[PDB]
Write an enzyme that holds these catalytic residues in place. Structure first.
Site, PDB file in Angstrom:
ATOM      1  CG  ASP A 119      -3.735 -26.750  -3.172  1.00 11.52           C
ATOM      2  OD1 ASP A 119      -2.920 -27.444  -3.841  1.00 11.52           O
ATOM      3  OD2 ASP A 119      -3.730 -25.517  -3.319  1.00 11.52           O
ATOM      4  CG  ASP A 128       6.917 -22.315  -6.224  1.00 13.01           C
ATOM      5  OD1 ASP A 128       5.691 -22.366  -6.528  1.00 13.01           O
ATOM      6  OD2 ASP A 128       7.443 -23.280  -5.597  1.00 13.01           O
TER       7      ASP A 128
END
Length: 251
Positions: A130, A11
């Protein structure tokens, strides 16, 4: 091959690894390029970089990351985070990325999957899904988990393959951020619905969790802080998986 892949997720924001790493051996333990190179050298099979830079500098920042990463590594890498259209995806692949990940934009405009695949091939297109249990059904969520789309996971997986995606990055919102294990029930749910490679994401805490994910039908397993904070050693992980019958790449 039917070799199971170990993938590191980085990230990033403004060209830095969000929350850094414990790798004191590096010149800069929060530099995502140096970190990515290090991972390629110690046995990671692919990288995924997910960017959360502010819109104004985001485009340039993602392009600079891709350019710099591409000159340091030879293993496949995916870039994602806020890719909303074909031209953005195109510039990133051309600048050096092997694949792009799309999620909210693909849900809102499924033709985006096909548009990218028609130029760059289905193998260039990772659709990140997701998902979360809601009232006993697996539902698809967008906007970094903020929006229940009301779309069933079962339906969206099928559509994603139909549209020409190459791989599904499956993140369980019910396990993400925890260290209790991958959501093997969710992986097992998805596996019969698609022929595409599945990258399991969310929940990894120990080596055994990787075995469980592969038994569930994942083709790859993705993790972040367990590697970044040296809770799991990649080579040791691969040793362990090979010992227990999993086809990993182990030089």
């Amino acid at each position: 091959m039917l070799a199971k892949r170990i993938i590191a997720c980085l990230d990033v924001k403004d060209g830095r690894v969000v929350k850094g790493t414990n790798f004191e051996n590096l010149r800069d333990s929060g530099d995502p390029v140096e970190l990515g190179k290090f991972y390629s050298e110690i046995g990671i099979d692919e990288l995924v970089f997910l960017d959360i830079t502010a819109s104004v500098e985001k485009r340039k920042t993602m392009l600079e990351l891709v350019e710099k990463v591409a000159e340091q590594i030879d293993i496949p890498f995916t870039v994602g985070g806020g890719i909303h259209d074909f031209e953005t995806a195109s510039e990133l692949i051309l600048r050096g990325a092997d694949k792009v990940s799309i999620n909210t934009a693909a849900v809102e405009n499924p033709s985006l999957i096909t548009q990218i695949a028609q130029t760059f091939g289905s193998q260039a297109v990772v659709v990140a899904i997701d998902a979360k249990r809601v009232d006993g059904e697996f539902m698809v969520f967008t906007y970094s988990g903020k929006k229940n789309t009301g779309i069933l996971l079962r339906d969206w997986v099928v559509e994603v393959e139909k549209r020409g995606a190459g791989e599904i990055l499956l993140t369980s919102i019910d396990r993400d951020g925890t260290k209790s294990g991958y959501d093997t029930e969710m992986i097992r749910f998805v596996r019969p619905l698609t022929t595409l490679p599945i990258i399991a994401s969310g929940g990894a805490g120990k080596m055994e969790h990787f075995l469980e994910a592969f038994l569930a039908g994942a083709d790859a397993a993705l993790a972040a802080s367990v590697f970044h904070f040296r809770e799991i050693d990649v080579r040791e992980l691969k040793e362990y998986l090979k010992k227990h019958g999993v086809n990993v790449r182990l030089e």
